[PDB]
Design a protein around this ligand. Structure first.
Ligand code: CL
Ligand code: CL
Ligand code: NA
Length: 128
């Protein structure tokens, strides 16, 4: 599923991401824009052989199982395919664990390089 911007904002807010760990909703929408272009089916291979999955590009090296990242962890206890569903519950629950682990949203490289320090409220402007 390719979410609309305001559609994703509403889903993220309903699942409790707005101000989670102090990160306002626009931070999460901006991160999703540049991680996946709002596409739940997005996948990208990393240099180390792990893969990033879903709207927030969660990495099989630590967070989910895809059966092809030898030596990785599965800290969210889910198959990586669950992060590609049109229903974003699994991705949000896993993102909550990631952002709680010490480095905040710096865990998302695209957030650090393209969202951090910018006017992230722009990403929820106009939405109901
Ligand atoms: Cl915001
Ligand atoms: Cl933080
Ligand atoms: Na894994």
């Amino acid at each position: 599923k390719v979410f609309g911007r305001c559609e994703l904002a509403a889903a993220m807010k309903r699942h409790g991401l707005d101000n989670y760990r102090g990160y306002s909703l626009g931070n999460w929408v901006c991160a999703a824009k540049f991680e996946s272009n709002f596409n739940t089916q997005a996948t990208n291979r990393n240099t180390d052989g792990s893969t990033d999955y879903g709207i927030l590009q969660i990495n099989s090296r630590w967070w989910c199982n895809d059966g092809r990242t030898p030596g990785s962890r599965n800290l969210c206890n889910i198959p990586c395919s669950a992060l590609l569903s049109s229903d974003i519950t699994a991705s949000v629950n896993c993102a909550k664990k990631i952002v709680s682990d010490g480095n905040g949203m710096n865990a998302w490289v695209a957030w650090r390089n393209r969202c951090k320090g910018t006017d992230v409220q722009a990403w929820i402007r106009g939405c109901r």
